[PDB]
């Protein structure tokens, strides 16, 4: 089955959440994406690899382009494996110093992208740089196939953000045309309504069993288990 991966920057809601997952599913956990301030991000590395074992993946999201290799340096010290660029379109230029820190470390660097005036050329130099590659499903249907073939010649994994149940359409049919595909990033799911839809339409395309992850940012921790297990089933 799917493994799960779990997006929540509250370290008193994502810890409450990983708590029940491990007493519950601990086998399905694949990794957290984790946010927020260095101090609380390193306690929160440190707290997930107590409760998991050491082959538990953490990527932590970096947000701001000049602080993000201190803040990565301190975060791999913790354990992070990996690093989720955000605002990259803005100094794409900014983005090799920082991956080629990322690479010294050993880390793997995931590249989110999303619209703005140098989204092909963030695009390029993500296919160039990463690892892996978050594209925002909402951006124009030919910047997004750009940007995935793109990452496909560069052999980038390609990992599509969707939120909206015409997005998971969206994506789902440029996935069966994108190798480099890999899984989806949830956004968006609020209820287990929602996550029903989600797994009736990833069976209904064969991509149960690609891992995926499920942001908690519209969720409660009861209903995020709830939601967690209704994607897994």
């Not at 998991?52 to 993946?57: H, I, S, T, Y």
């Amino acid at each position: 089955g799917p493994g799960i991966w779990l997006r929540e920057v509250d370290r008193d809601k994502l810890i409450a959440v990983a708590k029940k997952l491990k007493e519950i599913i601990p086998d399905r956990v694949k990794g957290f994406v984790v946010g927020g301030k260095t101090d609380d991000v390193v306690a929160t590395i440190r707290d997930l690899i107590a409760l998991f074992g050491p082959d538990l993946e953490i990527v932590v999201e970096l947000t701001e382009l000049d602080k993000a290799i201190e803040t990565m340096k301190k975060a791999v010290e913790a354990g992070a494996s990996a690093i989720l660029l955000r605002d990259g379109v803005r100094g794409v230029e900014e983005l090799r110093k920082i991956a080629e820190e990322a690479k010294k470390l050993g880390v793997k660097v995931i590249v989110d992208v999303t619209d703005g005036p140098d989204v092909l050329e963030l695009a390029r130099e993500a296919a160039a740089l990463a690892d892996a590659i978050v594209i925002d499903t909402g951006l124009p249907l030919d910047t997004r196939e750009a940007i995935a073939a793109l990452a496909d010649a560069a052999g980038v994994d390609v990992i599509f953000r969707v939120s909206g149940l015409d997005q998971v359409d969206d994506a789902v049919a440029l996935a069966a045309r994108t190798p480099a595909f890999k899984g989806f990033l949830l956004e968006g799911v609020r209820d287990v309504a929602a996550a029903e839809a989600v797994r009736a339409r990833l069976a209904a395309a064969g991509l149960t069993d690609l891992d995926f992850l499920l942001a908690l940012d519209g969720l409660d921790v009861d209903t995020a288990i709830a939601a967690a297990l209704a994607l897994l089933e």
